[PDB]
Write a protein that binds this DNA or RNA. Structure first.
Ligand SMILES: [K+]
Ligand SMILES: [K+]
Ligand SMILES: [Mg+2]
Ligand SMILES: [Mg+2]
Ligand SMILES: [Mg+2]
Ligand SMILES: [Mg+2]
Ligand SMILES: [Mg+2]
Ligand SMILES: [Mg+2]
Ligand SMILES: [Mg+2]
Ligand SMILES: [Mg+2]
Ligand SMILES: [Mg+2]
Ligand SMILES: [Mg+2]
Ligand SMILES: [Mg+2]
Ligand SMILES: [Mg+2]
Ligand SMILES: [Mg+2]
Ligand SMILES: [Mg+2]
Ligand SMILES: [Mg+2]
Ligand SMILES: [Mg+2]
Lengths: 101, 119, 88, 73
RNA sequence: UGGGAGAGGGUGGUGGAAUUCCCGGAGUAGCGGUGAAAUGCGCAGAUACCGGGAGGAACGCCGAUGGCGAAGGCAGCCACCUGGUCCACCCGUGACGCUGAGGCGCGAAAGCGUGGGGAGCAAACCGGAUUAGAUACCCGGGUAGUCCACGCCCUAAACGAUGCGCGCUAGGUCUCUGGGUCUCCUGGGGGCCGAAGCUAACGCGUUAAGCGCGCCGCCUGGGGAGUACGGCCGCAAGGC
C-alpha cells in the first residue's frame, strides 16, 4: 500500500441533498479499489483563481487514502465519470520538505 | 442609442495599423475606428499620428452615444499603442483604468517563418 | 519496485552462510531477480530501448560472475544454474 | 536591479511542497501569474524548483492563476 | 544496508494560454500586407469585440551561464512500469579486472510502406511584387511532409571537430548534487582563470591537448572521387 492524496474540486452550486449523495459514490469507488481513509479535510466552497466548468468557484474535497499502486489509475477513471466531480488530482504523499523554517 | 454612459475602449496595435473599439459596459461594441476608417491607406495607418486620430475619432462617435467613463485595454505592440492611449487621455472621456492584456501563448503554434529564425 | 523484504529473502535463500551479503551466489541470484523483472517489462514496452540497454548491462554482468564461478568452484557453478533456469 | 524586498524574508516558516497553502504561494507570483525569477523569490536552486512544481501543481487544481492582466500602466 | 538529485526511458490520463474553423450577440467599412506596393479577404457584413463549441499541435513564467542520458537526444501536470548514477557505513565476495576485430542493438532531420490524423507551418506548385532577368530574397495562397501506430531506412558540422580505462603532476574562482563536528573539510558533476609541462601557433592546463601504461579505430600530397567496378544491405531513395 502506498500513501496518496485525492484532491477533488466539485460543483459549488450543489445542495446538501446530492452533496452527501456524491460523497457516498466517492467513498464507494474509493473502497471498491482499495483506498483506506485517513486525515481528511472538506474545506468547502472557495473562489477558484479561474472559472472552471463555467463556474467561478469550487467545493474542495481533500483526502489521504493509502491504496494499492497498480489500482490508483483506475481509482481515477471511475472517479471522474461523475458530473459534479469536475477535477480529480491524486498525488503521492511526500514528507513536507520545509524551507526558511 | 442606448445611452451607454460608461464602457470600455479596446486599443489594438500592430506594426501595420491601429484600431480602437469602444464597447458597451461588457463586451458588445458600439463604434470603432482605425487608420483605415480615417484617411491613411498605405503604411501610414501605423504611424502614431494615425493611431492618434483613430482613437480620437473612435471616441467622438462614442460621445454621440453618450459615453463618459471608459476602461482602456491594450493589445499588441506598435508605435500607436501608448500613443492611442495617450490620445484617449485627452479626447473627452474619463479613463477609469488601463490594462495591458496582450495575447501571448504558452507556446503552441509554430509561427510564420517571418517570426521564427530561432529554433 | 523491489521491496526490501523481497530482496532480503533471496539473499538468505542463497547466502553461503550468515552475513553473506554479497557473494558470487548472492549476486547472481540477485542479478537474475532484476533481469527477470526488466525482461517481463520489455515484453510490454518494446519501445523502451533505454531500459533495454540496462538489460545487456545486467546480462553481461551475470555472465561475468558466472564465468568466474565455473572456473573457481566448478561445482558451485553447476549448483547455481541448476536452480535458476540459467544456461538453457 | 531588484531593489525592494525579497519574497524569502517577506515570509515565515513554510512548506514548499504545500500545493494547497494558497495564501502563502500567492506571494510567489508577479502582478502577473508568471512564477517569480529566483533572484526575487530569494529561494535556492533546489527550493525554487520544488516551489515551481508545487505552484504549477496547484494551478491545475484551480487555486492559483495561470495568467493575469497587467493593471496600472 | 541506509540516505540523495535528475527535461534518463515506455504506457495511460489530464491542464491552461494561443491559432484555425463553426454557432450566436453587438457592430460597420475596411482588413491585410510592404521599403513602397500589390495579389488576397470583406456589405452573402470581414477586420476589432463578447459568449459558446470542435479540433490538432506545442508547452509561457519557472529556466540558468542549471540538470539527466552511452550517443542521437530529453523540459506543462498526475499515476503506473523501468535504466543509469552520487554519497555514508566500512558490513559480504576475493582479482571476479580493462579494452574489444567480427556479431548484435540504439541511432537527429529528411525520406519510404500500410493505416489514421490534419489547427498552425510549409519543399513542389499557383499568384502578387522586385529586377535588365528573378525559375530568389519580400507579400498572398498552398500539396507532400510536419502528428500518431506499425514496419523500413542508418545518414549528419551524428562536434568538445578531442576513443575507452587507470595512475601521477600548484592553486584560485563560480556553480549543481551528497556526507560532516557546516569562518569551513570531504565526495561526485558543470564552468571560467591559471603551476609545472605541452603545442607550429591558437590554445590545452586534476573535466589535459601534461608524465605514463593497456586495448581498439584511423591517417600517409592535391584533383579524378566518396566516382567506377565488385560484393553486401535496402521496397526505393540509397547506404557500407
Ligand atoms: K478596397
Ligand atoms: K557506420
Ligand atoms: Mg471564442
Ligand atoms: Mg546536442
Ligand atoms: Mg576472506
Ligand atoms: Mg533514424
Ligand atoms: Mg521523421
Ligand atoms: Mg509516411
Ligand atoms: Mg500559410
Ligand atoms: Mg517579372
Ligand atoms: Mg510563402
Ligand atoms: Mg486550408
Ligand atoms: Mg558543437
Ligand atoms: Mg570539480
Ligand atoms: Mg598564449
Ligand atoms: Mg586555462
Ligand atoms: Mg593522387
Ligand atoms: Mg554518399
Amino acid at each position: 500500500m502506498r500513501r496518496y492524496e485525492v484532491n477533488i474540486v466539485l460543483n459549488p452550486n450543489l445542495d446538501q441533498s446530492q452533496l452527501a449523495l456524491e460523497k457516498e459514490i466517492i467513498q464507494r469507488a474509493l473502497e471498491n479499489y482499495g483506498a483506506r481513509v485517513e486525515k481528511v479535510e472538506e474545506l468547502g466552497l472557495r473562489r477558484l483563481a479561474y472559472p472552471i466548468a463555467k463556474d467561478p468557484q469550487g467545493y474542495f474535497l481533500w483526502y489521504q487514502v493509502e491504496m494499492p499502486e497498480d489500482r490508483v489509475n483506475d481509482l481515477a477513471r471511475e472517479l471522474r465519470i461523475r458530473d459534479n466531480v469536475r477535477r480529480v488530482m491524486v498525488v503521492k504523499s511526500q514528507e513536507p520538505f520545509l524551507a526558511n523554517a | 442609442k442606448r445611452q451607454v454612459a460608461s464602457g470600455r475602449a479596446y486599443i489594438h496595435a500592430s506594426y501595420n495599423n491601429t484600431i480602437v473599439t469602444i464597447t458597451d459596459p461588457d463586451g458588445n461594441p458600439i463604434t470603432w475606428s482605425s487608420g483605415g476608417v480615417i484617411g491613411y491607406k498605405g503604411s501610414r495607418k501605423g504611424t502614431p499620428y494615425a493611431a492618434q486620430l483613430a482613437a480620437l475619432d473612435a471616441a467622438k462617435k462614442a460621445m454621440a452615444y453618450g459615453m463618459q467613463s471608459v476602461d482602456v485595454i491594450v493589445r499588441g505592440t506598435g508605435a500607436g499603442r501608448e500613443q492611442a492611449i495617450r490620445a484617449l487621455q485627452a479626447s473627452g472621456l474619463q479613463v477609469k483604468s488601463i490594462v495591458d492584456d496582450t495575447p501571448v501563448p504558452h507556446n503552441g503554434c509554430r509561427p510564420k517563418k517571418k517570426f521564427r529564425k530561432a529554433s | 519496485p523491489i521491496t526490501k523484504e523481497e530482496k532480503q529473502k533471496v539473499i538468505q535463500e542463497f547466502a553461503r552462510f550468515p552475513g553473506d551479503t554479497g557473494s558470487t551466489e548472492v549476486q547472481v541470484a540477485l542479478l537474475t531477480l532484476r533481469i527477470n523483472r526488466l525482461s517481463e517489462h520489455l515484453k510490454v514496452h518494446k519501445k523502451d530501448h533505454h531500459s533495454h540497454r540496462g538489460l545487456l548491462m545486467m546480462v553481461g554482468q551475470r555472465r561475468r560472475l558466472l564465468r568466474y564461478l565455473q572456473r573457481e568452484d566448478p561445482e558451485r557453478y553447476r549448483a547455481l544454474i541448476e536452480k535458476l533456469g540459467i544456461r538453457g | 536591479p531588484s531593489r525592494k524586498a525579497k519574497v524569502k524574508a517577506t515570509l515565515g516558516e513554510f512548506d514548499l511542497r504545500d500545493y494547497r497553502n494558497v495564501e502563502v504561494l500567492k506571494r510567489f507570483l508577479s502582478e502577473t501569474g508568471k512564477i517569480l525569477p529566483r533572484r526575487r523569490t530569494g529561494l535556492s536552486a533546489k527550493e525554487q524548483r520544488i516551489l515551481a512544481k508545487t505552484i504549477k501543481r496547484a494551478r491545475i487544481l484551480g487555486l492559483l492563476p495561470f495568467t493575469e492582466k497587467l493593471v496600472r500602466k
